[PDB]
Amino acid sequence: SHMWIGVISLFPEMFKAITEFGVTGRAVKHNLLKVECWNPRDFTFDKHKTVDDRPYGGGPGMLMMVQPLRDAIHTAKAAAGEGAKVIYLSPQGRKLDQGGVTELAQNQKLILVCGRYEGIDERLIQTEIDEEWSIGDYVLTGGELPAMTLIDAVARFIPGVLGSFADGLLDCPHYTRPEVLEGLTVPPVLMSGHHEEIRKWRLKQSLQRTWLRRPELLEGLALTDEQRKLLKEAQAEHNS
Amino acid sequence: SHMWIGVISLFPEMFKAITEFGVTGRAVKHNLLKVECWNPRDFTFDKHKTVDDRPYGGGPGMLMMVQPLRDAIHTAKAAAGEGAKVIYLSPQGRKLDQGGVTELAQNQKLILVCGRYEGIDERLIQTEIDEEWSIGDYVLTGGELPAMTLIDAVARFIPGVLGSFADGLLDCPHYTRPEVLEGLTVPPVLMSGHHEEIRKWRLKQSLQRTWLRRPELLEGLALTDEQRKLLKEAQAEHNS
Ligand SMILES: Nc1nonc1C(=O)N[C@@H]1CC[C@H](O)C1
Numbered sequence: 119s120h121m122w123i124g125v126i127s128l129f130p131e132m133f134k135a136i137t138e139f140g141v142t143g144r145a146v147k148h149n150l151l152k153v154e155c156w157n158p159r160d161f162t163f164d165k166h167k168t169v170d171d172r173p174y175g176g177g178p179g180m181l182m183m184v185q186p187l188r189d190a191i192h193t194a195k196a197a198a199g200e201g202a203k204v205i206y207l208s209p210q211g212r213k214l215d216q217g218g219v220t221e222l223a224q225n226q227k228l229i230l231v232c233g234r235y236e237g238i239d240e241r242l243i244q245t246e247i248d249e250e251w252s253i254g255d256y257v258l259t260g261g262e263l264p265a266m267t268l269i270d271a272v273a274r275f276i277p278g279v280l281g282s283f284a285d286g287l288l289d290c291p292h293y294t295r296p297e298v299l300e301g302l303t304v305p306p307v308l309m310s311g312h313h314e315e316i317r318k319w320r321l322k323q324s325l326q327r328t329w330l331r332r333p334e335l336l337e338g339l340a341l342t343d344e345q346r347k348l349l350k351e352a353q354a355e356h357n358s
Numbered sequence: 359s360h361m362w363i364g365v366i367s368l369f370p371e372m373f374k375a376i377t378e379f380g381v382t383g384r385a386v387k388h389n390l391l392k393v394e395c396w397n398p399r400d401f402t403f404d405k406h407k408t409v410d411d412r413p414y415g416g417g418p419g420m421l422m423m424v425q426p427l428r429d430a431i432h433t434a435k436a437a438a439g440e441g442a443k444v445i446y447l448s449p450q451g452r453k454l455d456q457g458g459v460t461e462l463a464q465n466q467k468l469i470l471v472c473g474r475y476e477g478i479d480e481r482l483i484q485t486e487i488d489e490e491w492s493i494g495d496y497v498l499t500g501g502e503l504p505a506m507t508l509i510d511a512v513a514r515f516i517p518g519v520l521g522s523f524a525d526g527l528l529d530c531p532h533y534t535r536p537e538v539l540e541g542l543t544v545p546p547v548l549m550s551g552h553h554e555e556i557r558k559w560r561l562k563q564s565l566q567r568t569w570l571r572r573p574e575l576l577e578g579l580a581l582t583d584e585q586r587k588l589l590k591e592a593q594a595e596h597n598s
């Protein structure tokens with residue numbers, strides 16, 4: 119299930135971070151994922167290739183200039199053809215979570231608009247953007263890292279790209295060599311070779327860690343009978 | 359207030375995305391921000407420079423190999439000297455928000471450990487990591503994008519780096535040229551040159567957008583008298 123992602127960015131070279139390295143770099147090289155960038159600076163006409171503009175109403179800060187950005191977006195939409203969802207990354211957007219990632223991953227084509235400076239004209243959001251998404255409640259210098267984050271997360275859902283959380287829980291602890299590290303030993307159950315006991319231990323650990331660190335995540339879950347039991351056990355041991 | 363950030367990563371070249379471009383790239387060039395990377399692959403001793411290892415207990419997936427990663431971390435700590443906070447980026451960590459960013463930005467030195475594969479040995483977290491942080495409740499292919507995200511967010515707090523939210527609200531809409539765009543006009547108040555009316559309009563817009571999109575964010579705020587009034591006005595107009 120190929121995925122095509124168009125990107126509008128003043129700094130297209132930043133995306134080398136995901137297109138040239140690791141799992142996502144392999145996905146691109148194998149044509150499982152295609153990332154195509156358009157730079158508003160290429161759509162300027164003035165001598166100094168101006169890509170920012172002053173906000174009506176004054177105040178400090180600049181906005182992205184409308185014409186170059188708008189033209190870049192239109193060009194990306196033309197290349198994308200029918201059925202591309204246009205996304206603007208910003209703190210005003212829907213909060214991204216794994217459920218949201220799975221939904222976005224259902225799209226065969228995405229166009230990601232990366233804001234810089236104080237952002238983009240509200241009317242462009244109204245006329246060009248299908249959805250607004252945020253990767254988190256913090257403020258960055260640009261939308262590029264959010265876009266790459268989104269790309270990385272959805273890429274994991276593409277068949278062939280890959281060689282807890284899916285039940286809404288934090289991950290269990292992981293152990294590798296050596297058997298003893300600064301006096302700390304690997305839990306014996308992991309050495310037992312008892313697949314069922316290992317499965318239950320990992321699940322119990324996930325339930326316990328979710329409960330201790332992120333109890334609000336549990337309220338949103340319909341635990342299985344097995345999960346209810348193991349969580350009760352973990353809570354009992356914690357209270358022991 | 360200089361900031362030094364040590365990074366442990368199998369893909370140090372990804373960090374060119376923030377050290378070579380934009381506001382963060384300028385911060386680095388001007389020595390306001392220093393980013394220094396250590397690669398566990400450089401701390402391997404076997405012919406094929408192995409950086410992953412099999413998890414005790416079996417199951418699919420690999421973990422980062424302990425020895426190369428541990429040695430890389432120790433080297434970064436030695437370079438950092440006293441007072442460096444060591445952070446591991448992972449979904450099991452404290453959820454990052456702007457309040458959390460401000461807290462992290464108080465550190466003069468940070469060391470950021472970027473996990474790959476299924477993660478790192480739990481005992482390394484116990485023995486080497488000061489704090490665990492998450493950039494969001496979604497799953498990525500590596501900790502590098504989270505690390506860069508964290509770096510970008512804290513960099514904004516470094517004096518000289520910069521040329522909604524600080525009151526806990528979403529941003530107001532922004533407008534730039536032209537005055538009319540696809541039939542949509544700039545709100546006349548922004549053209550008035552009345553600084554006080556413009557300030558109040560922007561604040562009212564932020565309150566309204568926070569209320570409509572992220573009402574849970576309001577519950578955590580102690581609104582000023584002015585904010586209470588403007589929010590009431592916005593809600594009244596919405597109900598008109
Ligand atoms: N959080 C986020 N999720 O997506 N984007 C952001 C974000 O911080 N955007 C910044 C706002 C001003 C600057 O233009 C870029």
Ligand SMILES: Nc1nonc1C(=O)N[C@@H]1CC[C@H](O)C1
Nearest residue numbers: 447448474492493497498500504
């Ligand atoms: N969310 C996050 N905030 O910090 N890090 C992550 C994250 O998804 N880490 C991945 C887990 C497995 C892989 O090793 C990298």
